[PDB]
């Protein structure tokens, strides 16, 4: 029984994620994706300024 | 018989926990873990304020 508990703990060490780090990485990637959407939205309009020249 | 009782008392003094202090240490460690998880929940979103600038 102790050996089975140790084997399950070893699978958990090999496999399980450190969820508390993911709790910060998730919000960081959310803000990063929002900034990337804003950056692409601003980049879409750069060529359009040429119309003002005409 | 007295000698075996003396060895049992000596092994107990060598190993036994001070449970009356362990109750206070546990009651303090619970509050410490709760303050630590709350501090991590505060720390997770401080970078997220950068979205307000954009």
């Amino acid at each position: 029984g102790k050996l089975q508990d140790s084997l399950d703990a070893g699978v958990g060490n090999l496999v399980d994620a450190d969820l508390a780090k993911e709790s910060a990485k998730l919000q960081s990637l959310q803000t990063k994706q929002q900034l990337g959407v804003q950056a692409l939205s601003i980049a879409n309009q750069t060529p359009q300024t040429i119309l003002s020249l005409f």
Side-chain angles (χ1 to χ4, degrees), chain A residues 5-35:
Chain A
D5 274 7
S6 295
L7 281 149
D8 290 331
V11 185
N13 305 329
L14 291 173
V15 176
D16 271 348
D18 303 326
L19 271 181
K21 330 193 60 172
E22 324 287 346
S23 193
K25 214 162 71 73
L26 161 64
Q27 313 185 37
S28 302
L29 285 167
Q30 297 208 72
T31 300
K32 212 190 172 163
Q33 167 216 31
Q34 184 40 238
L35 264 55

Side-chain angles (χ1 to χ4, degrees), chain A residues 37-48:
Chain A
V37 178
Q38 299 213 13
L40 174 47
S41 176
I42 291 152
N44 287 337
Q45 324 174 330
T46 288
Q48 278 66 20

